[PDB]
Amino acid sequence: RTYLYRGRILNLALEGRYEIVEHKPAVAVIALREGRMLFVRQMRPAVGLAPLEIPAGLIEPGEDPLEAARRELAEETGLSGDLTYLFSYFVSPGFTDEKTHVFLAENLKEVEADEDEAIEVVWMRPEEALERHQRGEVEFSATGLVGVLYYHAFLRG
Amino acid sequence: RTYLYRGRILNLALEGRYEIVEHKPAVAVIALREGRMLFVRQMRPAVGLAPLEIPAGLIEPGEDPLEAARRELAEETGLSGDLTYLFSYFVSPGFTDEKTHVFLAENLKEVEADEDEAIEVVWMRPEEALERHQRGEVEFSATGLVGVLYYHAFLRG
Numbered sequence: 001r002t003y004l005y006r007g008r009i010l011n012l013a014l015e016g017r018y019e020i021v022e023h024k025p026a027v028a029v030i031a032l033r034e035g036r037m038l039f040v041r042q043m044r045p046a047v048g049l050a051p052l053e054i055p056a057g058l059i060e061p062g063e064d065p066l067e068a069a070r071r072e073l074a075e076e077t078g079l080s081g082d083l084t085y086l087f088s089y090f091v092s093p094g095f096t097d098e099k100t101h102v103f104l105a106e107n108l109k110e111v112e113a114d115e116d117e118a119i120e121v122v123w124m125r126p127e128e129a130l131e132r133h134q135r136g137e138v139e140f141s142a143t144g145l146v147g148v149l150y151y152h153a154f155l156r157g
Numbered sequence: 158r159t160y161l162y163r164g165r166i167l168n169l170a171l172e173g174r175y176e177i178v179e180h181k182p183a184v185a186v187i188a189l190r191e192g193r194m195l196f197v198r199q200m201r202p203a204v205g206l207a208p209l210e211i212p213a214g215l216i217e218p219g220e221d222p223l224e225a226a227r228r229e230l231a232e233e234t235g236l237s238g239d240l241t242y243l244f245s246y247f248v249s250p251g252f253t254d255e256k257t258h259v260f261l262a263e264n265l266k267e268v269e270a271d272e273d274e275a276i277e278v279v280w281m282r283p284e285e286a287l288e289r290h291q292r293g294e295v296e297f298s299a300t301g302l303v304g305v306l307y308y309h310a311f312l313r314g
């Protein structure tokens with residue numbers, strides 16, 4: 001593996017014929033409350049739009065997935081809760097090693113009453129999010145879709 | 158946006174402080190038959206392992222998502238069917254613009270009876286795939302997890 005670029009959140013490498021993008025692991029948090037799922041939106045320069053995502057972030061040096069999940073939920077929404085590890089997935093194993101760990105957040109509590117408004121909190125019924133996407137009103141990130149699908153599969157009971 | 162690298166399947170660009178990876182759009186096909194979902198595995202150099210995925214590929218010049226989905230299913234399994242567009246998602250909007258279009262494949266038929274064995278066809282019950290992942294026996298790609306979650310949510314009926 002030869003390196004063409006070493007950066008902030010990623011490294012571009014070449015492994016023979018394969019173009020590989022090394023990337024820090026990430027976490028995502030699925031939170032449901034009274035029928036509404038906690039979605040978030042922020043302008044994403046990579047796509048030039050703000051897709052419907054769920055609280056997510058990169059794992060910091062020294063912390064594990066669980067700790068990153070707790071911190072992410074807190075920084076984005078000022079909330080904490082009972083977190084349970086659900087599953088993990090490689091975002092696109094064909095070119096990047098980015099791995100995402102997904103957690104479920106229950107019994108949410110306020111720990112902080114973001115002042116910069118960098119992240120838009122969008123509480124919405126998953127059925128409504130799916131409906132809007134099917135209509136072409138909003139785009140989904142992998143985490144947003146996973147949250148929607150996970151809800152319909154196991155959280156209606 | 159300034160370019161640091163222009164390659165085969167991706168381009169590495171810099172947009173101020175943001176590191177952006179431009180990538181060709183992709184498709185994924187969810188196929189269920191008698192309780193089993195059509196999963197596939199292939200060694201992925203980016204991760205050094207073969208995660209559990211569903212038939213997927215990059216859209217070729219001149220074709221749309223539907224055509225790419227049909228071709229991908231055919232090349233990987235020698236099968237064709239009634240395809241229905243389900244939804245789309247950005248694999249990781251924080252750094253890449255890769256967008257994946259997901260389709261459902263029904264009433265599968267054999268059109269070709271891959272000789273190189275580059276892709277391993279793994280027919281498996283989604284409940285079993287989820288179980289194995291929870292046990293740490295196999296890793297999921299975003300497409301594999303989406304297929305599993307989609308099944309549990311809408312295909313058990």
Ligand SMILES: Nc1ncnc2c1ncn2[C@@H]1O[C@H](COP(=O)(O)OP(=O)(O)OC[C@H]2O[C@H](O)[C@H](O)[C@@H]2O)[C@@H](O)[C@H]1O
Pocket residue numbers: 017018019020091092093094095096165166183184203213214215216255298299300
């Ligand atoms: N990292 C890479 N760099 C250069 N060429 C590559 C790479 N990965 C695959 N290829 C080449 O591109 C061609 C195939 O692209 P697609 O087969 O159509 O396939 P694929 O890699 O299967 O899947 C697309 C989607 O699923 C995965 O999540 C992947 O990350 C992508 O988003 C192949 O001949 C192969 O030679």
Ligand SMILES: Nc1ncnc2c1ncn2[C@@H]1O[C@H](COP(=O)(O)OP(=O)(O)OC[C@H]2O[C@H](O)[C@H](O)[C@@H]2O)[C@@H](O)[C@H]1O
Pocket residue numbers: 008009026027046056057058059098141142143174175176177248249250251252253
């Ligand atoms: N493309 C980028 N290049 C450089 N720095 C970036 C980029 N995107 C975000 N950052 C910086 O990295 C820091 C934050 O990383 P995380 O906030 O933790 O966040 P995030 O981008 O939200 O989400 C992680 C996961 O969700 C998305 O699918 C994303 O693609 C990633 O997989 C921020 O201060 C921001 O300045």
